[PDB]
């Protein structure tokens, strides 16, 4: 059976931090999209430039699947033309985006009692990201006049910060697993 | 409205495993959408948070309670359990099952508070055996009469462990009733008394029955009290 | 582990007063503090959350405030039903020692003398080998009371136990029961049994008594 | 040529459920996506849901998600909208729209005439018709107050009067009922000499009232 | 969601005039913008899809243009059957389709002052416990008009409900009926009941009142 491995992305045991978001290329396969959405769970399902029902019409199947974890409050930033710490410094979608954004609450997986400090996000960055740019650097951010030379301190901050997902957080602070499919037509 | 109710053995031998069960009752509300926990209170002491079950594999246990705490939630039966192994006299307490209040959208807290509670069940860690109580009448007389009112009651003596519940006339008589806390006798058995004040003109015409229920021994006694 | 410190531990206020309870945290817990009310023989009842937000179904006279390390619970217009022990609970982090030590609020009322009653042992208990004589102190205030068991005018000590009810939620009184336990043989050796009661409301000690056989 | 006919609209109490239908004709119904769009009285247009051509896929707007359900029967060429847990904010006229299909994105190219869905906790009550006597030219009319639900038809002199007549849209008062006004400007001279009767008809309650208006 | 802002909210024209409506999007929606016409009491009708593609059967006097955020619908020669409301609708976010606030193309006429009439509550109604005072603004233009209920020279708010007719099919004027509603107890508490009307065609606000 030559079906596209959409299970390896949506069903991954571990998801990537948003600043180092994962990308999986899916090509040369027959994609069954109708059943993909069918799993009644996805709290967020929004497509741009394409209709989800009419994706089985596309002859080919050559799609990028980007996956990461953010706050519930930050789900709304995964969209064209959005601003904020995630859309500006972590994961930027273009204005002419052709694809779908899929997200679901994962508080039952990505939160620990003492706080799951494995998921990070970029807090400081001088300029916004280009669309689909991936900045994995953790150079000490110079917030002030004097340089840092890799040394932390005042006006010299580590650019990444952790979520610390706890199960007792509200849904805005709870973790959501996001999958972004990028289509080509 | 959600209602909790504990249920379990009021007597556990030392080094055994305590086992309690809390049943969630509500308007077809699923226990899969809430968190559930346990809180105990030793006699005459404060409140200790034992632990809360959030999701399968994401549980909190009081680190002062080491590795001897386990909490499981049965989402198809709407009830959760508490397992406490290697119990000692330091574990004799009243145990409550509580529901942590669900956080609001923007809540950032590390733990939670408990908005819905059970009624609490008293577990005693002891080596002694269970004993049903002997119910004796405290008959009203001229010495137990002040003016137009007279006092009568029941002496619930020699039982183990705690507790016992006393009701008068199947709960129809509540005003003027005083059920004193039990005292631990030198024999190692508990003993309390329950009294009620009634008008003197009703002693020969009204029947008064005290209903003593000792759950740990499955002992129910209905004792009629008459003037001697 | 963050430790919470309530002050005072106990207090006594008249009906209608303005009660204040302070809760102190060893470090800042932002505003994640809750207040509980626990009446005797009942589970704790949640009053306040987020230091100041009032729970549904709690009277408006309860209020809370505070942030950081020191918080305050306020009970405007104290009611006799408000007799309980109040706990504060930090929930900034799942850690041991989450509740405070508790503040027991007692209701202050006018002095009331107790109604004294004595009960001889029953025939059913006398036909079991034991004899228990019960003395009753019903509806009195304050809590302090003294009971002396006299057997043929001989003062007794070490053969009795006492038990005091919690403060009543309606008239704010106390009740006391003293049980003099003897063997049927030792009970059959004496004639006059009496408990002597002294209290703030009694200008002279009260003595209820019976004679074995009468 | 495309034909879309809705049915099943009416009144419903809060929290109850209601089901709409949409019979299609004159186009291959089984190869187009179908939409539902609602428009509150006096407000704009709000998309509600969409279903695939084969009925396997269903997506809803956030205002109705987990509350409404869309379905279709390609053997009958009918579109359905199961509406559960209806709130007051759900009171609107519901259209079913065909997707044009000529684009990668959705768009509505043919709409049905729509059907009204009134969500309120009031039962069907007849109106009370009160006169508005007059005090250049003069003005008089009738006040149609306290009726549920919409609509009411007001005519003057059994259709003999249509010039200088204004019938106003109804308003929803705090009592959950409706109030409507209807006026007419007549020559001031022929005031105590001409007969003026407003004909109020409430079909949901079958109340045909003819009240005479005189100074 | 993507917000669609139309401008103007309303415009007045005559037959033969060229009409142009603007539709802005809070973010770039590329070219997936559609135009709809809706008459009162009727379903909407699709005019333009994909910014500029004219729907089959629609007269060629309608046209669309623009991409990104600014879009335009132009009626080259306004015909009498083209007086309606016009909505734009973005289709870029295919699962969050949103419409514009609408643009009403009404008939342009001269300024007409309203004929103000006030009606006290009837005797038949006063026996029911409620009292309804009705103020009428008859045949005016344009639609912008303020109605102020004075009771003992004390302004009333949150106490009345307005209602405006569609633009008249003959004189092209509007009409308004405000209904002040208060109980019988609130009705004897006062005596003077007035209705102040402000309109473009009035050199000074006009008041019509009555004494109980
Ligand atoms: C992701 O994994 C889940 C299981 O963890 C798959 O869900 C099952 O799918 C089969 C059909 O292939 C059903 O018969 C089962 O009832 C499903 N079980 C559950 C628990 O969902 C799911 O298909 C996987 N998704 C992908 C895209 O591979």
CA E178 to chain centre: 15
Q: Which residue has the tokens 């001088």?
A: A126
Task: Specify whether A175 is located in the same domain as A98.
Answer: yes
Residue D63 vs residues A77, A101, A127, D91, E56: alpha-carbon distances, Å: 20, 19, 36, 13, 33
- CB contact set of D20 (below 8 Å; sequence gap of 6+): D6, D7, D8, D9, D36, D80, D81, D83, D94, D96, D115, D117
The CA distances from residue A136 to A90, B227, C93, C206, in Å, are 9, 89, 31, 87
For tokens 């899809």, name the residue: E49
Distance CA E51, CA E53 (A): 6
Q: What does the alpha-carbon distance between residue A64 and residue D53 come to, in Å, rounded to a whole number?
A: 26
- Contact in structure between C75 and C19 (CB atoms under 8 Å): yes
Nearest by CB to D130, from E96, E98, E122: name it.
Answer: E122
C176 CB neighbour count, 10 Å cutoff: 23
* Closest ligand 1 atom number to CA of residue A10: 27
Task: Tell me if residue A76 falls in helix, strand or coil.
Answer: helix
CA distances from B80 to B71, B120, E11, E65 (A): 7, 14, 66, 64
Measured over the CA atoms of residue A36, residue A40, residue A44 and residue A45, the dihedral's sign is positive
Which superfamily, per CATH, for C115-211? Answer: Immunoglobulins (2.60.40.10)
Is residue A52 located within the same domain as residue A80?
A: yes
Task: Compute the Cα dihedral for E93, E99, E100, E105 and give only its sign.
Answer: positive
Q: What is the 3-state secondary structure (H, E, C) of chain E?
A: CCCEEEECCEEEECCCCCEEEEEEECCCCCCCEEEEEECCCCCCEEEEECCCEECCCCCCCEEEECCCCEEEEEECCCCHHHCCEEEEEECCECCCCEEECCEEEEECCCCECCEEEEECCCHHHHCCCEEEEEEEEEEEECCCEEEEEEECCEEECCCEECCECCCCCCCCCEEEEEEEEEECHHHHCCCEEEEEEEECCCCCCEEEEEEC
Mutation pick from D45, D134, D137 vs chain E, by most beta carbons of E within 10 Å, is D45
Of ligand 1's atoms, which has the minimum distance to the CA of residue A8? 28
Sheet holding D78-83, edge to edge: D3-7, D18-25, D78-83, D68-73
**Which residues of B fall within a CB distance of 8 Å from C93?**
110-111
User: In angstroms, rounded to a whole number, what is the distance separating the alpha carbons of residues A128 and A120?
Assistant: 18
Check for a shared fold between D3-119 and D128-213: yes
> Considering only CA atoms, which of B102, B113, B90, B80 is closest in space to residue B40?
B90
How was this model experimentally determined? Answer: X-ray
Please say whether the beta carbons of E133 and E171 come within 8 A: no
Asked if C43's CB is within 8 angstroms of B96's CB, the reply is yes
Where in chain C is CATH 2.60.40.10?
Answer: 4-108, 115-211
Beta-bridge mates of residue C134: C119, C179
Widest pairwise Cα distance in chain A: 60
Q: Tokens for C81?
A: 């039903």
Query: Could you tell me which residues come within 8 angstroms of residue D28 by beta carbon, excluding any fewer than 6 positions away?
Result: none
D134's tokens = 């007059």
Q: Of D4, D13, D80, D2, which is closest to residue D48 (Cα–Cα)? A: D80
Contact between residue D95 and residue D37 where contact means Cβ atoms under 8 Å apart: yes
- Atom nearest to A9 CA in ligand 1: 27
CA distance E11 to B139: 96
Place of tokens 């335009």: E72
Say how many C-beta atoms besides its own lie within 10 A of residue D127's C-beta: 24
Residue from A51, A59, A75, A97 to probe the interface with D (highest D Cβ count within 10 Å): A51
Nearest CA to ligand 1 atom 17: A39
Nearest alpha carbon to residue B227 among C120, E113, C55, C23? C120
CA–CA distance, E124 with C197 (Å, rounded to integer): 79
Say whether D89 sits in a helix, a strand or coil: helix
Q: Ligand 1 mean position to A41 CA, how many Å? A: 12
Q: For domain D128-213, give the CATH superfamily.
A: Immunoglobulins (2.60.40.10)
CB C195 within 8 A of CB C147: yes
Q: Which structural domains are found in chain B, ordered by start?
A: 3-125 (2.60.40.10), 134-225 (2.60.40.10)
CA-nearest residue for atom 15, ligand 1, is A39
Q: Is C148 exposed, middle or buried (0-12, 13-18, 19+ CB in 10 A)?
A: middle
- What value, to the nearest 5°, has the Cα angle with vertex D4 and ends D1 and D9? 160
Q: Which of E24, E4, E6, E30 is nearest to E70 (CA)?
A: E24
What is the CATH superfamily name and number for domain E4-107? Answer: Immunoglobulins (2.60.40.10)
CA A48 to ligand 1 center in whole angstroms: 26
B56/A172 Cβ within 8 A: no
Q: Residue C63: exposed, middle, or buried by beta-carbon count in 10 A (0-12, 13-18, 19+)? A: middle
- Name the residue range of residue A138's domain: 115-166
Structure tokens at A15: 């998801």
Identify whether the C-beta of residue A30 lies closer than 8 Å to the C-beta of residue A61. Answer: yes
Looking at domain C4-108, what is its CATH homologous superfamily? Immunoglobulins (2.60.40.10)
Retrieve residue A23's tokens. Answer: 């990308």
Compute, in angstroms, the gap from residue A14 CA to the centroid of ligand 1: 17
List, in sequence order, every residue forming a beta bridge with A65; answer none if it has no partner.
A24, A181
Q: Which residues contact C73 (CB under 8 A, 6 or more apart)?
A: C20, C21, C23, C35, C47, C48, C62, C63, C64, C86, C88
Which whole-number Å values give the CA distances from C182 to A28, B97, B165, C131, C146, in the listed order? 95, 42, 26, 5, 20
Ligand 1 neighbourhood includes A11 CB (under 6 angstroms): yes
Of the residues A4, A5, A7, which should be mutated to test ligand 1's pocket, given the most ligand atoms within 8 Å of the CB? A7
User: Does the C-beta of A7 come closer than 6 Å to ligand 1?
Assistant: yes
Residues on chain A touching D59 (C-beta within 8 angstroms) = 45, 52
User: Quick one: A58 and A93 in the same domain?
Assistant: yes
Q: Rounded to whole angstroms, how far apart are CA atoms D149 and A163?
A: 53
Reported as type and span, the H/E element at residue C125 is: helix C123-126
In whole angstroms, what is the distance from residue A87 CA to residue A130 CA? Answer: 10
CA of B159 to the centre of ligand 1 (A): 57
Which position has the token pair 């008008």? B199
Specify whether the CB–CB gap between C178 and C164 falls below 8 A: no
Which chain A residue's Cα is nearest to E50?
A49
Residue of minimum CA distance from atom 10 in ligand 1: A39
What span, in angstroms and rounded, lies between the C-alpha atoms of B124 and B8?
A: 11
Query: DSSP code of C117?
Result: E
Residue D163: CB atoms within 10 A of its CB come to 8
Q: What are phi and psi of B205, to 5 degrees?
A: -105, -30
How many secondary structure helices (H) and strands (E) does chain E include? 2, 19
A154 and A99, same structural domain?
no
Residue ranges per structural domain of chain D: 3-119, 128-213
Q: From CA E3, how far away is CA E101, in angstroms rounded?
A: 9
Statement to judge: residues A123 and A93 lie in one domain: no
Dist. CA A64–CA A97, nearest whole Å:
12
Residues in B 142-171 with any Cβ partner in C closer than 8 A: 143-146, 149, 151, 153, 155, 157
Contact A185 D59 (CB under 8 A): no
CA torsion D24-D28-D30-D31 (nearest 10°) is -130
Helix (H, G, I), strand (E, B) or coil at C57: coil
- Whether the CA torsion C155, C157, C159, C164 is positive or negative: it is positive
Mutation target among E30, E90, E91, E97 for the A interface, most CBs of A within 10 A: E30
Residues 6+ apart with CB under 8 A from D140: D131, D132, D133, D134, D183, D184, D186, D196, D213, D215
Q: Are strands A141-142 and A156-157 parallel, antiparallel or unpaired?
A: antiparallel
C180 contacts C133 by C-beta, under 8 angstroms: yes
Q: From the CB coordinates, do chains A and C have 3 or more pairs under 8 Å?
A: yes
CA distance B94 to D26: 74
CA-nearest of D90, D184, B141, C154 to E177 is D184
Residues in chain B: 228
- Residue E100 touches chain D, beta carbons under 8 Å: yes
For chain E, how are helix, strand and coil distributed in percent, rounded to 5?
5, 50, 45
d(CA A13, CA A69) in angstroms, rounded, equals 12
Q: Which residues pair with C20 in a beta bridge?
A: C74
Peptide bond into B161 cis (omega under 30): yes
* Chain D residues lying within 8 Å of E87, measured CB to CB: 44-45
Instruction: Report whether B198 contacts B206 (CB < 8 A).
Output: yes
Given the DSSP bridges, would you call strands D10-12 and D115-119 parallel, antiparallel or unpaired? parallel
CA distance C98 to C77: 29
Q: Which residues are CB-contacts of B6 (< 8 A; sequence separation ≥ 6)?
A: B20, B21, B22, B95, B96, B97, B118, B119, B120, B121
Radius of gyration of chain A (CA): 18
Chain E touched by A84 (CB under 8 Å): no
B153 within 8 A of B194, measured Cβ to Cβ: yes
Q: Which two tokens stand for residue A85?
A: 């710490």
Check whether residue A107 and residue A35 sit in a common domain. Answer: yes
In contact, E44 and E35? CB cutoff 8 Å: no
CATH superfamily of D3-119: Immunoglobulins (2.60.40.10)
- Split into its structural domains, chain A has a count of 2
Q: How far lies B7's CA from each of B4, B31, D66, in Å?
A: 10, 17, 37
Q: Is any atom of ligand 1 closer than 6 Å to the C-beta of A97? A: no
Structure tokens, D42: 């006096």
Task: Output the residue whose Cα is nearest ligand 1's atom 3.
Answer: A11
End-to-end CA distance of chain B: 49
The yes-or-no reply on A/E contact (3 CB pairs or more, < 8 Å) is: yes
């Amino acid at each position: 059976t030559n079906l596209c491995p959409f299970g390896e992305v949506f069903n991954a045991t571990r998801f990537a931090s948003v600043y180092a978001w994962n990308r999986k290329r899916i090509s040369n396969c027959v994609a069954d999209y109708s059943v993909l959405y069918n799993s009644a769970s996805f709290s967020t399902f929004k497509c741009y430039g394409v209709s989800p029902t009419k994706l089985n019409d596309l002859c080919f199947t050559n799609v990028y699947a980007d996956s990461f974890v953010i706050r519930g409050d930050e789900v709304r930033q995964i969209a064209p033309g959005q601003t904020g710490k995630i859309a500006d410094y972590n994961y930027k979608l273009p204005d002419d985006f052709t694809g779908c954004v899929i997200a679901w609450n994962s508080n039952n997986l990505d939160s620990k009692v003492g706080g799951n400090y494995n998921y990070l996000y970029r807090l400081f960055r001088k300029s916004n990201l280009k669309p689909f740019e991936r900045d994995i650097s953790t150079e000490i951010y110079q917030a002030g006049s004097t340089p840092c030379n890799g040394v932390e301190g005042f006006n010299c901050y580590f650019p990444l910060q952790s979520y610390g997902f706890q199960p007792t957080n509200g849904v805005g602070y709870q973790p959501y697993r996001v999958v972004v499919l990028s289509f080509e037509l | 409205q959600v209602q909790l109710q504990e249920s379990g053995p009021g007597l556990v031998k030392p080094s055994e495993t305590l086992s309690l069960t809390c049943t969630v009752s509500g308007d077809s509300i699923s226990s899969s959408r809430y968190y559930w926990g346990w809180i105990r209170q030793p006699p005459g002491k404060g409140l200790e948070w034992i632990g809360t079950f959030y999701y399968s594999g994401i549980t909190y246990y009081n680190p002062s309670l080491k590795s001897r705490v386990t909490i499981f939630v049965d989402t198809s039966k709407n009830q959760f359990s508490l397992k406490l192994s290697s119990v000692t006299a330091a574990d004799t307490a009243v145990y409550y099952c509580a529901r942590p209040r669900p956080p609001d959208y923007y809540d950032n807290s590390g733990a939670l508070l408990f908005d819905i509670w059970g009624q609490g069940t008293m577990v005693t860690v002891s080596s002694a055996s269970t004993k049903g109580p002997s119910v004796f009448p405290l008959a009203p007389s001229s010495k137990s009469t002040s003016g137009g009112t007279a006092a009568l009651g029941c002496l619930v003596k020699d039982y183990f462990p705690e507790p016992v519940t006393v009701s008068w006339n199947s709960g129809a008589l509540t005003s003027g009733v005083h059920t004193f806390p039990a005292v631990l006798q030198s024999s190692g058995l508990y003993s309390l008394s329950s009294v009620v004040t009634v008008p003197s003109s009703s002693l020969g015409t009204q029947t008064y029955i005290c209903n003593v229920n000792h759950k740990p021994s499955n002992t129910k006694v209905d004792k009629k009290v008459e003037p001697k | 582990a963050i430790r919470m410190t309530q002050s005072p531990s106990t207090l006594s206020a008249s009906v209608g007063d303005r009660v204040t309870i302070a809760c102190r945290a060893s470090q800042s817990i932002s505003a994640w503090l809750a207040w509980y009310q626990q009446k005797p023989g009942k589970a704790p009842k949640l009053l306040i959350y987020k230091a100041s937000s009032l729970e549904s179904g709690v009277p408006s006279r309860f209020s809370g405030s505070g942030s950081g390390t020191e918080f305050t619970l306020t009970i405007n217009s104290l009611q006799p039903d408000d007799f309980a022990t109040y706990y504060c609970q930090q929930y900034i982090s799942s850690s041991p020692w989450t509740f405070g030590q508790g503040t027991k609020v007692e209701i202050k009322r006018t002095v009331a003398a107790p109604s004294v009653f004595i009960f001889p042992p029953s025939d059913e208990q006398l036909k079991s080998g034991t004899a228990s004589v019960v003395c009753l102190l019903n509806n009195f205030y304050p809590r302090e009371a003294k009971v002396q068991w006299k057997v043929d005018n001989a003062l007794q000590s070490g053969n009795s136990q006492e038990s005091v009810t919690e403060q009543d939620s309606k008239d704010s009184t106390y009740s006391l029961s003293s049980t003099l336990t003897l063997s049927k043989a030792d009970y059959e050796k004496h004639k006059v049994y009496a408990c002597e009661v002294t209290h703030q409301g009694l200008s002279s000690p009260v003595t209820k008594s019976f004679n074995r056989g009468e | 040529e495309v034909q879309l006919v809705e049915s099943g609209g009416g009144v419903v109490q809060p929290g109850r459920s209601l089901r709409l239908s949409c019979a299609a004709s004159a186009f291959t119904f089984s190869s187009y996506d179908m939409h539902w769009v609602r428009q509150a009285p006096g407000k704009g247009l709000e998309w509600v849901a969409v279903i695939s051509y084969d009925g396997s896929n269903k997506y809803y707007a956030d205002s109705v998600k987990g509350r409404f359900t869309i379905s279709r029967d390609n053997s009958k060429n009918t579109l359905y909208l199961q509406m559960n847990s209806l709130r007051a904010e759900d009171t609107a006229v519901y259209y079913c729209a065909k997707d044009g299909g000529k684009l990668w994105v959705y768009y509505f190219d043919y709409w049905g005439q729509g059907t009204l869905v009134t969500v309120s906790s009031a039962s069907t009550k007849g109106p009370s018709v009160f006169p508005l006597a007059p005090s250049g030219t003069a003005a008089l009319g009738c006040l149609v107050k306290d009726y549920f639900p919409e609509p009411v038809t007001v005519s003057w002199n059994s259709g003999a009067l249509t010039s200088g007549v204004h019938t106003f849209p109804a308003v929803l008062q705090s009592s959950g009922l409706y109030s409507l006004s209807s006026v007419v400007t007549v020559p001031s001279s022929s005031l105590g000499t001409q007969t003026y009767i407003c004909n109020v008809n409430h079909k949901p309650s079958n109340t045909k009232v003819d009240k005479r208006v005189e100074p």
